[PDB]
């Protein structure tokens, strides 16, 4: 399924090249611009423990957050910063770029690998 595909074929978009954040572009977007730190970002997302979703659709509204402001896990700040408007991307994320050894119960156990599908709807400058 989609997580194994990202393990097998995903790009490593981490600076350290530790495979902590792996990406596949599943639908291409438009525009020379990706979001940069500070931007308000609008997404729809499906996310799940890679073991086997929480989704923005469940709540019938987009998920809204400021990039690089620590409002989302590291893997999002890194991953979404690579995405173009209208893009759909799959991310697979080792715990070091999500909730770590501590976890975040009850939803996230210690040392959890996470998978998302993200659609970048829009972004606006600070
Ligand atoms: C660990 O806590 C949660 C994790 C996740 C979703 C949670 C959640 O309860 C606070 O509830 C949904 C509400 C709307 O979210 C508000 C804020 C989310 C924040 O931005 C943080 C907590 O979430 C994140 O940084 C990431 C990325 C953005 C979307 C939420 N995500 C999650 O880790 C999900 C998580 C995904 C794996 C399946 C279980 C839910």
Question: What is the atom index within ligand 1 of the atom nearest the CA of 65?
Answer: 20
- Which residue, chain included where needed, has tokens 């890194």? 78
Q: How far is CA 73 from the centre of its chain?
A: 8
Resolution (A): 1.7
Cα–Cα distance, 123 to 63 (Å, whole number)? 12
45 flagged as catalytic: yes
Experimental method: X-ray
For ligand 1, is residue 114 a contact (CB within 6 Å)? yes
Q: 93: which strand partners?
A: 21, 114
Question: What is the atom index within ligand 1 of the atom nearest the CA of 104?
Answer: 1
For residue 82, what are the contacts with CB-CB under 8 A and spacing of at least 6? 13, 23, 34, 89
Sign of CA dihedral 92, 85, 66, 14: positive
Q: Centre a 10 Å sphere on the Cβ of residue 89 and count the other Cβ atoms it contains.
A: 24
Cα–Cα distance, 59 to 41 (Å, whole number)? 17
Closest residue by CA, ligand 1 atom 7:
54
Nearest Cα residue to 26 out of 95, 119, 104: 119
């Amino acid at each position: 399924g989609a997580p194994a595909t990202v393990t097998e074929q995903g790009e490593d978009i981490t600076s350290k090249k530790d495979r902590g954040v792996l990406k596949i572009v599943k639908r291409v977007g438009n525009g020379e611009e990706t979001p940069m730190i500070g931007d308000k970002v609008y997404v729809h997302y499906k996310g799940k423990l890679s073991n086997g979703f929480d989704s923005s659709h469940d709540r019938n509204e987009p998920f809204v957050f400021s990039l690089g402001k620590g409002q989302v896990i590291k893997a999002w700040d890194i991953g979404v910063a690579t995405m173009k408007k209208g893009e759909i991307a799959h991310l697979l994320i080792k715990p070091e770029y999500a909730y770590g050894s501590a976890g975040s119960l009850p939803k996230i156990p210690s040392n959890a690998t996470l998978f998302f599908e993200i659609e970048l709807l829009d972004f606006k400058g600070e």
